[PDB]
Design a protein around this ligand. Structure first.
Ligand code: SIA
Lengths: 486, 441, 474
């Protein structure tokens, strides 16, 4: 008669690494590194992204005619722009503090255009000036949202125009100053020569004089338009005053935020799925602590890491350690045991059998669960934008960001790598111990009444029927008997 | 003879990688969460208290900022969120954030008269404004001087100052932007005016901007202040045909190091600290805290946790080695001398208490801690710079939290196992001696 | 059953103890340099000597002794360079320029507005502030357009960039001390300097005012720069006060490095990691040589030692074998970490257990290797450049650099500590398992002494012994 102590072993080929070994085969394993996406650009926490198509934020805001096909939502959560957008400043020039503007617009709670200096009211000034650089149908046109004030009659009276912001939200307002190619152009557009463009608020005070000079031709244009912007507060007013060269707004933009997102560079288009974490390659949907999909994410994302696999062993070493039981003094595992991780055999005259030890396999499965769950749910995860915008005179600011983004990459990678490695030698040892303790718990009961074979089995001197066996696995067994002895 | 382990009446719970809600005999918390609700001196030196004033209001001499204490040496700055008294006269202050950063912590700071008001003969020196009113009557930033037309003549205003006070000197100046060409004339006569400021390093020329504006404090005009740091033995040259708001005083400034501005409603209180938060002052040897993210001084790592508890004693039983709560079913309340015993085993309880000591001490004293400001200042055209700081401050938050959480968790399954082993080794040390002469129950 | 013990005095620390002596140990903290400034990944650094980037580019006469490579990987500048703007003034967006020039793939000067062609303008103006041999001179690379005859015609000059690479171009605007100087240099008074490209549009008027004298000069020169694109043109136009370029700079990059402040000179050695104290050459994960590095460097940490135990506790734990129920180690055993003794009537002996010492040495190898080769390492510059109106940007960088210092230090410290209590326990276990593997075989036929030895009842000749170490025996 006999009773044995053994551990599970299936047909798995899953490999994990531990601090001390590598290519170690285990019965079951969990991967905690997310690497898959749904190849779609999506709504972020339920709200869509502003799709710009081929347009740039500047082109959109200014009303480039080439940007008319734009959807124009009231509320968006990030911005889809392209790398190198085709239609921006149709009329050559520049946009002051442009990055900051995009950062602002990167995520809006409510955003609505409103007419604030209607085109008609500029009597005493020519209002219809366009340019073939903004051509709609071969004919000269102009940024829809703006107005090109030029000489009327042969007289450019001091252009004055203000606007009290009453729409009950902060208002974004953009304006411009035109830089002619030559003093003639300046005159045949404005009459005056010593001109200036003056913009003021409770907070702003900016005066600009135009720069008349020859320049390389852009879209056949040597002249330039320099746009600036401010955020007109609630109940505050904005005062325009100019003797020429002002490109004034027709429209404002009520804007309410909310929070702050970022601009996502991509060729793709919105697609009507959901996500809490969007990449330029697609959307991530995971509970996992780490991923390697793409560094430029937006939303609540896992830690981006430079790894290809991060695998936790969860089951035991598959054997077709610290305590020397598994693949130790117990040479191999039993495919025959299916109920659980560890258990017994017993060879009787009533029949042979396998039977997992419920209590020990339970206490273990629960533990390994806490482990995996711990590695996963202790990870703090907030909402970030990552991808960022910097000008050409900001290569250092940009590089400071990169030094920082890299720093965290290195830190998270080294940790997640070693976390898996260290936690894995522990897990195996854990299983090994459990078995070794299960072995010892029987050896200590049986004591004198069994030969200790050494393969992890015990050969009973006395006969040990089913009931008896069950007492050995019970915790009963005793012992008085004695027998033998004889 | 018996082999057993200690077990008191504790209810203290810790978590381990493998289990949670585990009860241990004794435990240490390494997360600091308490403050003394006071704003305090930092490393012995006080903070500049601004009260309702803004740094700008203070420096320019807003009349509303006269009640200010004005120490010679401070270690941080107490400002409010939305200070009532700043630029009484509407306008702006160039490179303001940078200035605040500079002034955030001074080793020595002392006002000195450098272009005395009197000496501006040939210029009217007494101009004020009801926007800076003291007692219904028009007044003006005390530290500044409003040069205006005298007689009906504004001669080229010239004034220089050689810095001899043997310290770097902060100097602030201004350019007035009138509401209309009339105001400009009835203040300065001239129309094509400019304000010129120069040093060995500085060269700035400004023309005033005459334009209509929204009224602020009933004022459409504006004042635009700029500043420089005049070096030792260097000179500053003012020159102007109008619209210059020149300084009467400079500020000798020596630093030292660098602190930061702390936003708070509260007032200084005469306690000490090496670590100040807006909620109060922290006093701890602990490696982590969650008091408030905006700290100044030598602080523990700010972490997003509520508890971080190290088990130190053993599992309380009223593991890897299967002794504790294992083949030895329970603990003895009867044993009081130490952790394990038969009468506690002095040598084994000692070697263990020493070990668990090294553990806790190691977790605590390996933490590198330097002096930082955290809270920071950024303008409106700096929302990105600001956001870059937040992405970074968050990044570290996530890193430290994830680590401290798991550190506690991992180090706790180890500690218990440690105890378990010690017992099991104590048991084996006896079983191996006794051998043949005892029944092994 | 016993374990190895040599004559080592090497000490490591563990979570639970300190000053623990082990048989063998590995240090993973690099602290040594070769005291040389070196080529970085095969390419040399631009050596500036006493010159500043500005002095170099503008052609300060004092900067003629410069080597001038076509391709460099970092820049050697000094803290407080003697020769920069010989003529007092300033340089707009200077930091950014240095950052750009910090590392070039190809860099070559080319004449783009030859001095001669400025007829109708005096081209020979110098200054004793840029004196070569007591005589007035001027930035070699620049040209001081001044009145010719008594007439300063509108100065015009353009240049189409055809050299097939981005071109750096620097220009200047002169700020006279007084309206007289302005006239006796340019005739005109309402002057302006105008510079344009497809992207640039800058107009500057000179500032005439009195100033503290620098190099006996109250006047000032204010230089600005742009990056003229391929096939783009740059248009100068000026009625006075323009200090125009004679030369451009073809520039191609590549990547991005940084400026290294040092007194020393290039030396013809190699490195992938350069510090201001010398060059690092290591596979180690951490170092404490100096924080301002350039290249692929280990993590800079605030430690003095970071030592992994690798061999076992030297005894002249969790499992209670080493320094436990087996009181000491055997100097007699040399073959490996653990093994047996056996006292026979054919002779005594020592003999390490090959299979167990192997499996262990392999493991401890994976450990060290793992700590070392999982460390992600990229190329960075660290040291950085910020102006005086950037004390915040600078401080933001310091808060960040510190942040990582604290993080890496706390981790490497604890990594070593934790991994070391594990390593010792590991050895302890291996022994204890070796002991149990024999006890389980021998069973009934031996008295179990208790010192880690077994006394055979039956006689156990050589063959027999070998069966005990075999795995046979029966
Ligand atoms: C006139 C000219 O082109 N260069 C002359 C300058 C300039 O007049 C002033 O530096 C500009 O204000 O004056 C010098 O005395 C000088 O600087 O050494 C001599 C030099 O030949």
């Amino acid at each position: 008669d006999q009773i044995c102590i053994g551990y599970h072993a299936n047909n798995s080929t899953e490999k994990v690494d531990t601090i001390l070994e590598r290519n170690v085969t285990v019965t079951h394993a969990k991967d905690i590194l997310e690497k898959t996406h749904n190849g779609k650009l999506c709504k972020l926490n339920g709200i869509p992204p502003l799709e710009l198509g081929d347009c740039s934020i500047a082109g959109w805001l200014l009303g480039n005619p080439e940007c008319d096909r734009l959807l124009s939502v009231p509320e968006w959560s990030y911005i889809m722009e392209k790398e190198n957008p085709r239609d921006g400043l149709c009329y050559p020039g520049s946009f002051n503090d442009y990055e900051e503007l995009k950062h602002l617009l990167s995520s809006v709670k409510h955003f609505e255009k409103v007419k604030i200096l209607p085109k008609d009211r500029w009597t005493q000034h020519t209002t219809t000036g366009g340019s073939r650089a903004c051509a709609v149908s071969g004919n000269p046109s102009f940024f829809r949202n703006m107005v090109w004030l030029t000489e009327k009659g042969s007289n450019y009276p001091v252009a004055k125009g203000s606007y009290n912001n009453t729409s009950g939200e902060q208002m974004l307002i953009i304006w411009g100053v035109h830089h002619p190619n030559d003093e003639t152009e300046q005159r045949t557009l404005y009459q005056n020569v010593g001109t200036y463009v003056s913009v003021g608020t409770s907070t702003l005070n900016k005066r600009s004089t135009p720069d008349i000079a020859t320049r390389p031709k852009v879209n056949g244009l040597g002249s330039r338009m320099e746009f600036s912007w401010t955020l007109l507060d609630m109940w505050d007013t904005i005062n325009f005053e100019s003797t020429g060269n002002l490109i004034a707004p027709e429209y404002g933009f009520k804007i309410s935020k909310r929070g702050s997102s970022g601009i996502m560079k991509t060729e793709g288009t919105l697609e009507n799925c959901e996500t809490k974490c969007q990449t330029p390659l697609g959307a991530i949907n995971t509970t996992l602590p780490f991923h390697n999909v793409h560094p430029l994410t937006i939303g609540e994302c896992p830690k981006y890491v430079k790894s290809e696999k991060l695998v936790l062993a969860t089951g035991l070493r598959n054997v077709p350690g610290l305590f020397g039981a598994i693949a130790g003094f117990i040479e191999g595992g039993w495919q025959g045991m299916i109920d659980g991780w560890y258990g017994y055999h017993h060879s009787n005259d009533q029949g042979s059998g396998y039977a997992a030890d419920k209590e020990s396999t339970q206490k273990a499965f629960d533990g390994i669960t806490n482990k995996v769950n711990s590695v996963i749910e202790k990870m703090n995860t907030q909402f970030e934008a990552v991808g960022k915008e910097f000008s050409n005179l900001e290569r250092r600011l940009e590089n400071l960001n990169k030094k920082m983004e890299d720093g965290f990459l290195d830190v998270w990678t080294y940790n997640a790598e070693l976390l898996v490695l260290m936690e894995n030698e522990r897990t195996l040892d854990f299983h090994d111990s459990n078995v070794k303790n299960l072995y010892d718990k029987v050896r200590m009961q049986l004591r004198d009444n069994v030969k200790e074979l050494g393969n992890g089995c015990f050969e009973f001197y006395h006969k040990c029927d089913d009931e008896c066996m069950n007492s050995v696995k019970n915790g009963t067994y005793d012992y008085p008997k004695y027998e033998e002895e004889s």
